[PDB]
Symmetry: C3
Subunit: 198 residues, 3 copies
Protein backbone atom coordinates (compact mmCIF):
# COMPACT_ATOMS: atom_id res chain seq x y z
CA UNK A 1 0.00 0.00 0.00
CA UNK A 2 1.31 3.47 1.02
CA UNK A 3 5.00 3.17 2.04
CA UNK A 4 6.28 0.33 4.24
CA UNK A 5 5.48 -0.75 7.82
CA UNK A 6 8.01 -1.05 10.68
CA UNK A 7 7.24 -4.73 10.50
CA UNK A 8 8.22 -5.27 6.85
CA UNK A 9 11.45 -3.33 7.42
CA UNK A 10 12.39 -5.83 10.17
CA UNK A 11 11.74 -8.65 7.74
CA UNK A 12 13.77 -7.03 4.95
CA UNK A 13 16.65 -6.43 7.36
CA UNK A 14 16.57 -10.00 8.77
CA UNK A 15 16.69 -11.49 5.29
CA UNK A 16 19.47 -9.21 4.16
CA UNK A 17 21.55 -10.25 7.16
CA UNK A 18 20.87 -13.89 6.57
CA UNK A 19 22.16 -13.45 2.94
CA UNK A 20 25.09 -11.43 4.25
CA UNK A 21 26.02 -14.28 6.51
CA UNK A 22 26.03 -16.90 3.65
CA UNK A 23 29.56 -15.82 2.64
CA UNK A 24 27.99 -12.54 1.38
CA UNK A 25 26.80 -13.81 -1.99
CA UNK A 26 25.06 -17.12 -1.34
CA UNK A 27 27.01 -19.40 -3.79
CA UNK A 28 29.01 -22.49 -2.89
CA UNK A 29 32.79 -21.87 -3.38
CA UNK A 30 34.64 -24.89 -4.74
CA UNK A 31 37.99 -23.04 -4.40
CA UNK A 32 37.59 -22.54 -0.62
CA UNK A 33 40.56 -24.15 1.06
CA UNK A 34 38.62 -25.22 4.19
CA UNK A 35 36.12 -26.96 1.88
CA UNK A 36 39.03 -29.13 0.49
CA UNK A 37 40.49 -26.99 -2.30
CA UNK A 38 44.22 -26.24 -2.60
CA UNK A 39 46.65 -24.38 -4.67
CA UNK A 40 49.17 -26.25 -6.89
CA UNK A 41 52.30 -24.46 -5.47
CA UNK A 42 54.44 -25.71 -8.29
CA UNK A 43 51.97 -24.01 -10.70
CA UNK A 44 51.84 -20.41 -9.29
CA UNK A 45 53.70 -17.17 -9.80
CA UNK A 46 56.49 -16.68 -7.29
CA UNK A 47 55.35 -14.95 -4.11
CA UNK A 48 56.45 -11.40 -3.56
CA UNK A 49 56.99 -10.01 -0.06
CA UNK A 50 55.09 -6.67 0.15
CA UNK A 51 56.33 -5.93 3.73
CA UNK A 52 60.05 -5.65 2.65
CA UNK A 53 60.62 -1.98 3.62
CA UNK A 54 59.49 -2.94 7.16
CA UNK A 55 60.89 -6.47 7.37
CA UNK A 56 64.28 -4.94 6.80
CA UNK A 57 64.00 -1.39 8.19
CA UNK A 58 62.41 -2.73 11.50
CA UNK A 59 62.91 -6.56 11.70
CA UNK A 60 61.47 -10.07 10.99
CA UNK A 61 58.86 -10.74 13.75
CA UNK A 62 59.31 -14.18 15.22
CA UNK A 63 55.74 -15.43 14.39
CA UNK A 64 55.92 -13.78 10.95
CA UNK A 65 55.25 -15.67 7.69
CA UNK A 66 55.03 -14.55 4.09
CA UNK A 67 51.54 -14.51 2.58
CA UNK A 68 51.56 -17.57 0.21
CA UNK A 69 49.32 -18.45 -2.66
CA UNK A 70 46.83 -20.40 -0.48
CA UNK A 71 45.75 -17.10 1.06
CA UNK A 72 43.55 -16.55 -2.03
CA UNK A 73 41.50 -19.57 -0.93
CA UNK A 74 40.94 -18.17 2.60
CA UNK A 75 38.10 -16.01 3.63
CA UNK A 76 39.93 -13.50 5.89
CA UNK A 77 40.32 -10.43 3.73
CA UNK A 78 41.44 -7.80 6.24
CA UNK A 79 44.09 -5.41 4.76
CA UNK A 80 47.34 -7.30 4.15
CA UNK A 81 45.63 -10.71 3.95
CA UNK A 82 46.30 -11.03 0.19
CA UNK A 83 48.78 -12.97 -1.83
CA UNK A 84 51.17 -10.71 -3.71
CA UNK A 85 53.21 -11.44 -6.85
CA UNK A 86 55.79 -9.19 -8.58
CA UNK A 87 54.64 -6.81 -11.38
CA UNK A 88 51.19 -6.86 -13.08
CA UNK A 89 51.10 -10.43 -14.50
CA UNK A 90 50.79 -13.59 -12.42
CA UNK A 91 48.67 -16.73 -12.15
CA UNK A 92 47.66 -19.37 -9.73
CA UNK A 93 46.33 -22.82 -10.35
CA UNK A 94 43.70 -24.18 -8.06
CA UNK A 95 42.57 -27.68 -7.50
CA UNK A 96 38.89 -27.44 -6.57
CA UNK A 97 37.23 -29.38 -3.75
CA UNK A 98 35.03 -31.22 -6.32
CA UNK A 99 34.83 -31.69 -10.09
CA UNK A 100 32.28 -29.14 -11.29
CA UNK A 101 30.95 -27.40 -14.31
CA UNK A 102 32.05 -23.81 -13.72
CA UNK A 103 29.47 -21.05 -14.13
CA UNK A 104 31.02 -18.07 -12.30
CA UNK A 105 34.08 -16.86 -10.37
CA UNK A 106 34.36 -14.23 -7.71
CA UNK A 107 37.26 -11.98 -7.06
CA UNK A 108 37.42 -9.46 -4.22
CA UNK A 109 39.84 -6.81 -3.04
CA UNK A 110 40.16 -4.68 0.09
CA UNK A 111 37.83 -1.65 -0.07
CA UNK A 112 39.25 1.81 -0.92
CA UNK A 113 38.02 3.21 2.41
CA UNK A 114 40.47 0.87 4.21
CA UNK A 115 43.58 1.60 2.08
CA UNK A 116 46.10 4.47 2.35
CA UNK A 117 44.94 7.37 0.10
CA UNK A 118 41.81 5.40 -0.88
CA UNK A 119 43.52 3.84 -3.84
CA UNK A 120 44.06 0.22 -4.55
CA UNK A 121 46.48 0.35 -7.37
CA UNK A 122 47.75 -3.14 -6.66
CA UNK A 123 44.32 -4.72 -7.27
CA UNK A 124 44.13 -7.03 -10.26
CA UNK A 125 42.48 -5.58 -13.37
CA UNK A 126 42.13 -7.79 -16.49
CA UNK A 127 42.28 -11.43 -15.88
CA UNK A 128 41.27 -14.80 -17.36
CA UNK A 129 40.13 -18.16 -16.10
CA UNK A 130 41.30 -21.50 -17.66
CA UNK A 131 40.07 -25.07 -16.98
CA UNK A 132 42.44 -28.08 -17.23
CA UNK A 133 40.37 -31.24 -17.68
CA UNK A 134 43.27 -33.56 -16.85
CA UNK A 135 45.55 -33.72 -13.85
CA UNK A 136 48.82 -33.61 -15.96
CA UNK A 137 47.82 -30.07 -16.64
CA UNK A 138 49.74 -28.62 -19.61
CA UNK A 139 46.90 -27.43 -21.86
CA UNK A 140 44.47 -24.74 -20.66
CA UNK A 141 41.07 -23.96 -22.18
CA UNK A 142 39.98 -20.33 -21.84
CA UNK A 143 36.76 -20.22 -19.79
CA UNK A 144 36.48 -16.42 -19.80
CA UNK A 145 38.22 -13.09 -19.62
CA UNK A 146 37.12 -10.34 -17.29
CA UNK A 147 38.14 -7.09 -15.65
CA UNK A 148 38.07 -6.37 -11.94
CA UNK A 149 36.75 -2.88 -11.67
CA UNK A 150 38.57 -0.76 -9.12
CA UNK A 151 35.60 1.66 -8.84
CA UNK A 152 33.17 -1.16 -8.27
CA UNK A 153 32.20 -3.05 -5.14
CA UNK A 154 34.92 -4.85 -3.18
CA UNK A 155 33.45 -8.30 -4.04
CA UNK A 156 32.74 -8.82 -7.75
CA UNK A 157 31.28 -11.91 -9.37
CA UNK A 158 31.84 -12.90 -13.07
CA UNK A 159 29.56 -15.24 -14.99
CA UNK A 160 30.99 -17.24 -17.89
CA UNK A 161 29.08 -16.44 -21.10
CA UNK A 162 27.38 -19.71 -22.14
CA UNK A 163 29.80 -22.33 -20.73
CA UNK A 164 30.02 -25.77 -22.36
CA UNK A 165 28.91 -28.50 -20.05
CA UNK A 166 32.60 -29.47 -19.63
CA UNK A 167 33.54 -30.28 -16.02
CA UNK A 168 36.80 -29.48 -14.31
CA UNK A 169 38.59 -29.96 -11.10
CA UNK A 170 41.60 -27.76 -11.85
CA UNK A 171 41.34 -24.10 -12.85
CA UNK A 172 43.79 -21.25 -13.23
CA UNK A 173 43.47 -17.65 -12.35
CA UNK A 174 45.68 -15.65 -14.66
CA UNK A 175 46.09 -11.99 -13.97
CA UNK A 176 46.84 -9.90 -17.17
CA UNK A 177 47.12 -6.38 -15.79
CA UNK A 178 46.81 -4.54 -12.47
CA UNK A 179 45.48 -1.15 -11.52
CA UNK A 180 48.90 0.36 -12.11
CA UNK A 181 51.01 -0.47 -9.09
CA UNK A 182 54.56 -0.57 -10.47
CA UNK A 183 55.88 -3.26 -8.07
CA UNK A 184 53.21 -5.91 -7.39
CA UNK A 185 49.70 -7.20 -7.61
CA UNK A 186 47.82 -8.35 -4.46
CA UNK A 187 45.00 -11.00 -4.63
CA UNK A 188 42.61 -11.07 -1.55
CA UNK A 189 40.25 -13.98 -2.39
CA UNK A 190 39.33 -15.94 -5.44
CA UNK A 191 36.22 -18.16 -5.52
CA UNK A 192 34.92 -20.60 -8.10
CA UNK A 193 31.21 -21.42 -8.38
CA UNK A 194 29.44 -24.02 -10.54
CA UNK A 195 27.40 -27.27 -10.59
CA UNK A 196 28.72 -30.49 -9.05
CA UNK A 197 27.85 -34.25 -9.77
CA UNK A 198 24.37 -35.67 -9.21
Amino acid sequence: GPGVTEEQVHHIVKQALQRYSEDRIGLADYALESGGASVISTRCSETYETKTALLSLFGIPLWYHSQSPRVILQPDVHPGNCWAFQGPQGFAVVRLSARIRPTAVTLEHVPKALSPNSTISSAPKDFAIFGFDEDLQQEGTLLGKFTYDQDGEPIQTFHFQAPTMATYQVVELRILTNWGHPEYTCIYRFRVHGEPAH
Copy 2:
Protein backbone atom coordinates in the same frame (compact mmCIF):
# COMPACT_ATOMS: atom_id res chain seq x y z
CA GLY B 1 1.79 7.12 11.88
CA PRO B 2 1.51 6.30 8.12
CA GLY B 3 4.40 3.97 7.13
CA VAL B 4 7.97 4.55 8.32
CA THR B 5 10.46 7.42 7.81
CA GLU B 6 13.93 7.10 6.23
CA GLU B 7 15.19 8.01 9.66
CA GLN B 8 13.55 5.13 11.57
CA VAL B 9 14.78 2.68 8.93
CA HIS B 10 18.37 3.81 9.66
CA HIS B 11 17.76 3.20 13.33
CA ILE B 12 16.24 -0.25 12.75
CA VAL B 13 19.17 -1.19 10.52
CA LYS B 14 21.81 0.09 12.99
CA GLN B 15 20.27 -1.90 15.83
CA ALA B 16 19.95 -5.04 13.76
CA LEU B 17 23.63 -4.82 12.86
CA GLN B 18 24.64 -4.24 16.42
CA ARG B 19 22.71 -7.46 17.40
CA TYR B 20 24.24 -9.25 14.43
CA SER B 21 27.66 -8.36 15.67
CA GLU B 22 27.04 -9.77 19.23
CA ASP B 23 27.80 -13.31 17.98
CA ARG B 24 24.48 -13.15 16.06
CA ILE B 25 22.17 -14.04 18.93
CA GLY B 26 23.25 -11.91 21.88
CA LEU B 27 23.82 -14.67 24.54
CA ALA B 28 27.04 -15.42 26.38
CA ASP B 29 28.52 -18.79 25.25
CA TYR B 30 30.13 -20.76 28.07
CA ALA B 31 31.32 -23.44 25.59
CA LEU B 32 33.39 -20.94 23.54
CA GLU B 33 36.96 -22.16 23.53
CA SER B 34 38.50 -18.65 23.46
CA GLY B 35 36.40 -17.82 26.55
CA GLY B 36 38.15 -20.74 28.43
CA ALA B 37 36.05 -23.78 27.53
CA SER B 38 37.57 -27.02 26.20
CA VAL B 39 36.63 -30.39 25.00
CA ILE B 40 37.46 -33.51 27.07
CA SER B 41 39.29 -35.37 24.21
CA THR B 42 39.20 -38.62 26.10
CA ARG B 43 35.37 -38.24 26.25
CA CYS B 44 34.48 -37.69 22.52
CA SER B 45 33.60 -39.82 19.55
CA GLU B 46 36.60 -40.64 17.39
CA THR B 47 37.25 -38.04 14.70
CA TYR B 48 36.50 -38.97 11.14
CA GLU B 49 38.46 -37.49 8.25
CA THR B 50 35.91 -36.20 5.66
CA LYS B 51 38.64 -35.16 3.14
CA THR B 52 39.85 -38.81 2.58
CA ALA B 53 39.03 -39.09 -1.16
CA LEU B 54 41.24 -36.00 -1.68
CA LEU B 55 43.89 -36.62 0.97
CA SER B 56 44.65 -39.82 -0.82
CA LEU B 57 43.69 -39.16 -4.46
CA PHE B 58 45.68 -35.80 -4.45
CA GLY B 59 47.97 -35.68 -1.33
CA ILE B 60 48.40 -34.56 2.34
CA PRO B 61 49.12 -30.78 2.24
CA LEU B 62 52.04 -29.90 4.45
CA TRP B 63 50.10 -27.40 6.69
CA TYR B 64 47.09 -29.74 6.76
CA HIS B 65 45.45 -30.92 10.02
CA SER B 66 42.37 -32.99 10.72
CA GLN B 67 39.39 -31.08 12.13
CA SER B 68 39.31 -32.17 15.83
CA PRO B 69 36.56 -31.98 18.38
CA ARG B 70 37.59 -28.49 19.62
CA VAL B 71 36.40 -27.07 16.30
CA ILE B 72 32.83 -27.19 17.70
CA LEU B 73 33.91 -24.58 20.26
CA GLN B 74 35.27 -22.20 17.58
CA PRO B 75 33.33 -19.55 15.86
CA ASP B 76 34.63 -19.95 12.27
CA VAL B 77 31.90 -21.86 10.50
CA HIS B 78 32.93 -21.57 6.85
CA PRO B 79 32.24 -24.81 4.88
CA GLY B 80 34.57 -27.57 6.08
CA ASN B 81 35.15 -25.95 9.50
CA CYS B 82 33.16 -28.67 11.32
CA TRP B 83 34.15 -31.64 13.38
CA ALA B 84 33.11 -34.91 11.76
CA PHE B 85 32.50 -38.31 13.36
CA GLN B 86 31.69 -41.63 11.64
CA GLY B 87 28.00 -42.62 11.09
CA PRO B 88 24.96 -40.85 12.64
CA GLN B 89 25.71 -41.24 16.39
CA GLY B 90 28.47 -39.42 18.26
CA PHE B 91 29.00 -37.23 21.32
CA ALA B 92 31.35 -34.71 22.72
CA VAL B 93 31.87 -33.64 26.28
CA VAL B 94 32.61 -30.05 26.99
CA ARG B 95 34.06 -28.43 30.02
CA LEU B 96 32.52 -24.97 30.18
CA SER B 97 34.42 -21.77 30.95
CA ALA B 98 32.38 -21.32 34.17
CA ARG B 99 29.97 -23.33 36.33
CA ILE B 100 26.50 -22.27 35.22
CA ARG B 101 22.88 -23.17 35.36
CA PRO B 102 22.13 -24.08 31.75
CA THR B 103 19.07 -22.56 30.10
CA ALA B 104 19.70 -23.04 26.36
CA VAL B 105 22.11 -24.48 23.78
CA THR B 106 22.77 -23.42 20.24
CA LEU B 107 23.72 -25.60 17.37
CA GLU B 108 24.47 -24.33 13.88
CA HIS B 109 25.33 -25.85 10.53
CA VAL B 110 26.57 -24.49 7.20
CA PRO B 111 23.67 -23.05 5.15
CA LYS B 112 22.20 -25.06 2.23
CA ALA B 113 23.06 -22.26 -0.21
CA LEU B 114 26.78 -22.90 0.47
CA SER B 115 26.73 -26.74 0.13
CA PRO B 116 26.92 -28.90 -3.03
CA ASN B 117 23.35 -29.60 -4.28
CA SER B 118 21.90 -27.46 -1.45
CA THR B 119 21.64 -30.41 0.87
CA ILE B 120 23.24 -30.88 4.21
CA SER B 121 22.63 -34.49 4.85
CA SER B 122 25.52 -34.71 7.27
CA ALA B 123 23.97 -32.15 9.65
CA PRO B 124 22.99 -33.52 13.05
CA LYS B 125 19.27 -34.18 13.55
CA ASP B 126 18.07 -35.50 16.95
CA PHE B 127 20.35 -34.88 19.79
CA ALA B 128 20.44 -34.58 23.60
CA ILE B 129 22.29 -32.57 26.19
CA PHE B 130 23.52 -34.06 29.53
CA GLY B 131 25.04 -32.30 32.58
CA PHE B 132 27.66 -34.02 34.78
CA ASP B 133 27.76 -32.29 38.17
CA GLU B 134 31.06 -33.88 39.17
CA ASP B 135 34.43 -33.91 37.46
CA LEU B 136 34.78 -37.78 37.62
CA GLN B 137 32.04 -37.77 35.08
CA GLN B 138 30.41 -41.21 34.75
CA GLU B 139 26.74 -40.39 35.34
CA GLY B 140 24.86 -38.02 33.00
CA THR B 141 21.57 -36.28 33.74
CA LEU B 142 19.42 -35.60 30.69
CA LEU B 143 18.93 -31.82 30.36
CA GLY B 144 16.92 -32.01 27.14
CA LYS B 145 16.38 -33.66 23.79
CA PHE B 146 15.99 -31.69 20.60
CA THR B 147 16.06 -31.89 16.83
CA TYR B 148 18.16 -29.72 14.55
CA ASP B 149 15.89 -28.88 11.69
CA GLN B 150 17.59 -29.06 8.31
CA ASP B 151 14.93 -26.78 6.73
CA GLY B 152 15.34 -24.20 9.44
CA GLU B 153 17.82 -21.37 9.87
CA PRO B 154 21.53 -22.20 9.96
CA ILE B 155 21.81 -21.17 13.65
CA GLN B 156 19.18 -22.72 15.93
CA THR B 157 18.80 -22.18 19.65
CA PHE B 158 17.11 -24.70 22.05
CA HIS B 159 15.70 -23.76 25.44
CA PHE B 160 15.53 -26.40 28.17
CA GLN B 161 11.92 -26.84 29.34
CA ALA B 162 11.87 -25.75 33.01
CA PRO B 163 15.46 -26.57 34.12
CA THR B 164 16.16 -27.34 37.78
CA MET B 165 18.43 -24.80 39.34
CA ALA B 166 21.24 -27.40 39.20
CA THR B 167 24.58 -25.95 38.06
CA TYR B 168 27.15 -27.63 35.89
CA GLN B 169 30.54 -27.12 34.47
CA VAL B 170 30.64 -30.21 32.25
CA VAL B 171 28.04 -30.98 29.60
CA GLU B 172 27.76 -33.48 26.77
CA LEU B 173 26.41 -33.09 23.32
CA ARG B 174 25.12 -36.43 22.15
CA ILE B 175 24.02 -36.75 18.59
CA LEU B 176 21.28 -39.45 18.07
CA THR B 177 20.63 -39.24 14.33
CA ASN B 178 21.78 -37.23 11.31
CA TRP B 179 20.02 -35.98 8.23
CA GLY B 180 20.80 -39.23 6.45
CA HIS B 181 24.41 -39.04 5.35
CA PRO B 182 25.51 -42.69 5.30
CA GLU B 183 29.18 -42.04 6.25
CA TYR B 184 29.44 -39.22 8.82
CA THR B 185 27.96 -36.40 10.79
CA CYS B 186 29.58 -32.92 10.77
CA ILE B 187 29.19 -30.47 13.75
CA TYR B 188 29.95 -26.74 12.94
CA ARG B 189 29.49 -25.03 16.35
CA PHE B 190 27.89 -25.88 19.63
CA ARG B 191 27.19 -23.20 22.26
CA VAL B 192 25.93 -23.41 25.82
CA HIS B 193 24.07 -20.53 27.45
CA GLY B 194 22.91 -20.10 31.06
CA GLU B 195 23.32 -18.14 34.34
CA PRO B 196 26.66 -17.95 36.14
CA ALA B 197 27.54 -17.28 39.91
CA HIS B 198 26.67 -14.01 41.64
Copy 3:
Protein backbone atom coordinates in the same frame (compact mmCIF):
# COMPACT_ATOMS: atom_id res chain seq x y z
CA GLY C 1 7.27 11.92 -0.04
CA PRO C 2 5.00 10.02 2.43
CA GLY C 3 7.08 7.37 4.27
CA VAL C 4 9.60 5.15 2.45
CA THR C 5 9.24 2.55 -0.34
CA GLU C 6 10.28 -1.13 -0.10
CA GLU C 7 12.83 -0.21 -2.71
CA GLN C 8 14.60 2.53 -0.72
CA VAL C 9 14.72 0.26 2.33
CA HIS C 10 16.66 -2.32 0.24
CA HIS C 11 19.08 0.41 -0.75
CA ILE C 12 19.52 1.65 2.82
CA VAL C 13 20.12 -1.91 4.01
CA LYS C 14 22.63 -2.70 1.22
CA GLN C 15 24.65 0.41 1.99
CA ALA C 16 24.62 -0.21 5.71
CA LEU C 17 25.96 -3.71 5.13
CA GLN C 18 28.63 -2.49 2.81
CA ARG C 19 29.78 -0.02 5.57
CA TYR C 20 29.51 -2.81 8.13
CA SER C 21 31.83 -4.91 6.06
CA GLU C 22 34.55 -2.16 5.80
CA ASP C 23 35.88 -3.13 9.27
CA ARG C 24 32.65 -1.62 10.71
CA ILE C 25 33.72 2.02 10.69
CA GLY C 26 35.26 2.66 7.28
CA LEU C 27 38.71 4.06 8.35
CA ALA C 28 42.11 2.64 7.47
CA ASP C 29 43.83 1.16 10.58
CA TYR C 30 47.58 1.75 10.66
CA ALA C 31 47.89 -0.38 13.84
CA LEU C 32 46.44 -3.51 12.16
CA GLU C 33 49.03 -6.25 12.44
CA SER C 34 48.13 -7.90 9.10
CA GLY C 35 48.63 -4.48 7.45
CA GLY C 36 52.29 -4.48 8.75
CA ALA C 37 52.00 -3.00 12.24
CA SER C 38 53.54 -4.64 15.32
CA VAL C 39 53.85 -4.24 18.98
CA ILE C 40 57.23 -3.35 20.57
CA SER C 41 57.25 -6.30 23.07
CA THR C 42 60.05 -4.77 25.05
CA ARG C 43 57.83 -1.66 25.48
CA CYS C 44 54.57 -3.20 26.88
CA SER C 45 53.12 -4.01 30.26
CA GLU C 46 53.75 -7.60 31.29
CA THR C 47 51.04 -9.99 30.11
CA TYR C 48 48.69 -11.38 32.69
CA GLU C 49 47.12 -14.82 32.29
CA THR C 50 43.33 -14.43 32.89
CA LYS C 51 42.66 -18.21 32.54
CA THR C 52 44.75 -19.13 35.69
CA ALA C 53 41.92 -20.64 37.80
CA LEU C 54 41.29 -23.05 34.87
CA LEU C 55 44.85 -23.55 33.64
CA SER C 56 45.64 -24.87 37.06
CA LEU C 57 42.34 -26.32 38.34
CA PHE C 58 41.81 -28.26 35.00
CA GLY C 59 45.12 -28.27 32.99
CA ILE C 60 47.28 -26.57 30.27
CA PRO C 61 45.77 -27.61 26.88
CA LEU C 62 48.45 -28.74 24.49
CA TRP C 63 47.64 -26.14 21.74
CA TYR C 64 47.15 -23.43 24.38
CA HIS C 65 49.00 -20.08 24.29
CA SER C 66 48.76 -16.98 26.43
CA GLN C 67 47.11 -13.96 24.79
CA SER C 68 50.08 -11.60 24.08
CA PRO C 69 50.16 -7.91 23.36
CA ARG C 70 49.85 -8.38 19.55
CA VAL C 71 46.28 -9.54 20.08
CA ILE C 72 45.28 -5.84 20.32
CA LEU C 73 46.32 -5.47 16.67
CA GLN C 74 44.12 -8.40 15.53
CA PRO C 75 40.58 -8.14 14.43
CA ASP C 76 39.10 -11.26 16.12
CA VAL C 77 37.33 -9.91 19.16
CA HIS C 78 35.31 -12.91 20.33
CA PRO C 79 35.19 -13.18 24.18
CA GLY C 80 38.64 -14.04 25.52
CA ASN C 81 40.47 -12.66 22.45
CA CYS C 82 41.91 -9.71 24.42
CA TRP C 83 45.29 -8.96 25.84
CA ALA C 84 45.22 -8.74 29.63
CA PHE C 85 47.62 -6.94 31.98
CA GLN C 86 47.64 -6.95 35.81
CA GLY C 87 45.69 -4.21 37.71
CA PRO C 88 44.17 -1.05 36.14
CA GLN C 89 47.29 0.60 34.62
CA GLY C 90 49.20 -0.71 31.61
CA PHE C 91 50.47 0.43 28.22
CA ALA C 92 51.49 -0.89 24.89
CA VAL C 93 53.65 0.67 22.24
CA VAL C 94 52.78 0.12 18.65
CA ARG C 95 54.83 0.56 15.57
CA LEU C 96 52.38 1.52 12.83
CA SER C 97 52.39 0.11 9.30
CA ALA C 98 53.20 3.60 7.90
CA ARG C 99 54.28 7.01 9.19
CA ILE C 100 51.08 9.02 9.53
CA ARG C 101 49.60 12.11 11.03
CA PRO C 102 47.20 10.67 13.61
CA THR C 103 43.64 11.99 13.69
CA ALA C 104 41.72 9.33 15.67
CA VAL C 105 42.05 6.04 17.55
CA THR C 106 39.52 3.31 18.09
CA LEU C 107 39.20 1.09 21.07
CA GLU C 108 36.65 -1.71 21.38
CA HIS C 109 35.63 -4.20 24.03
CA VAL C 110 33.42 -7.30 24.08
CA PRO C 111 29.73 -6.34 24.38
CA LYS C 112 27.93 -6.67 27.76
CA ALA C 113 25.41 -9.10 26.25
CA LEU C 114 28.25 -11.61 25.70
CA SER C 115 29.87 -11.36 29.18
CA PRO C 116 28.92 -13.13 32.44
CA ASN C 117 26.43 -10.93 34.38
CA SER C 118 26.48 -8.33 31.57
CA THR C 119 29.33 -6.45 33.13
CA ILE C 120 32.68 -5.71 31.68
CA SER C 121 34.53 -4.46 34.65
CA SER C 122 37.89 -5.33 33.13
CA ALA C 123 37.36 -2.95 30.17
CA PRO C 124 39.76 -0.02 30.03
CA LYS C 125 38.35 3.32 31.18
CA ASP C 126 40.60 6.43 31.05
CA PHE C 127 43.47 6.22 28.74
CA ALA C 128 45.92 8.35 26.74
CA ILE C 129 47.71 8.18 23.43
CA PHE C 130 51.37 9.32 22.95
CA GLY C 131 53.40 9.71 19.72
CA PHE C 132 57.18 9.09 19.64
CA ASP C 133 58.66 10.82 16.60
CA GLU C 134 61.95 8.95 16.80
CA ASP C 135 62.70 5.24 16.88
CA LEU C 136 64.90 5.46 20.08
CA GLN C 137 61.66 6.17 21.81
CA GLN C 138 62.21 7.64 25.29
CA GLU C 139 60.16 10.85 25.11
CA GLY C 140 56.38 10.72 24.52
CA THR C 141 54.19 13.60 23.39
CA LEU C 142 50.60 13.45 24.64
CA LEU C 143 48.27 13.25 21.63
CA GLY C 144 45.07 12.98 23.68
CA LYS C 145 43.34 11.62 26.73
CA PHE C 146 40.02 9.84 26.56
CA THR C 147 37.63 7.58 28.41
CA TYR C 148 36.21 4.32 27.11
CA ASP C 149 32.62 4.36 28.17
CA GLN C 150 31.39 1.03 29.48
CA ASP C 151 27.73 1.99 28.79
CA GLY C 152 28.51 2.98 25.24
CA GLU C 153 28.80 0.95 22.07
CA PRO C 154 31.34 -1.88 21.95
CA ILE C 155 33.47 -0.05 19.32
CA GLN C 156 34.29 3.57 20.21
CA THR C 157 36.30 6.01 18.14
CA PHE C 158 38.20 9.05 19.60
CA HIS C 159 39.22 12.07 17.57
CA PHE C 160 42.25 14.10 18.66
CA GLN C 161 41.24 17.73 19.29
CA ALA C 162 43.13 19.81 16.70
CA PRO C 163 46.28 17.68 16.14
CA THR C 164 49.50 19.35 14.99
CA MET C 165 50.57 18.19 11.60
CA ALA C 166 53.32 16.13 13.31
CA THR C 167 53.71 12.63 11.84
CA TYR C 168 54.52 9.47 13.72
CA GLN C 169 55.21 5.87 13.19
CA VAL C 170 55.29 4.81 16.85
CA VAL C 171 52.43 5.41 19.27
CA GLU C 172 51.60 4.23 22.77
CA LEU C 173 48.35 3.25 24.28
CA ARG C 174 48.48 3.95 27.98
CA ILE C 175 45.63 2.77 30.10
CA LEU C 176 45.07 4.94 33.27
CA THR C 177 42.10 3.24 34.91
CA ASN C 178 39.74 0.32 34.29
CA TRP C 179 36.08 -0.22 34.97
CA GLY C 180 36.91 -1.54 38.42
CA HIS C 181 38.09 -5.10 37.98
CA PRO C 182 40.46 -5.63 40.92
CA GLU C 183 42.83 -8.07 39.14
CA TYR C 184 43.32 -7.07 35.48
CA THR C 185 42.43 -5.02 32.47
CA CYS C 186 41.62 -6.70 29.12
CA ILE C 187 42.20 -4.90 25.74
CA TYR C 188 40.26 -6.39 22.71
CA ARG C 189 41.45 -4.20 19.79
CA PHE C 190 43.17 -0.89 19.39
CA ARG C 191 43.23 0.93 16.03
CA VAL C 192 45.02 4.06 14.88
CA HIS C 193 43.66 6.21 12.05
CA GLY C 194 45.22 9.22 10.30
CA GLU C 195 46.70 10.61 7.04
CA PRO C 196 49.68 8.97 5.33
CA ALA C 197 52.37 10.42 2.87
CA HIS C 198 51.44 11.79 -0.56
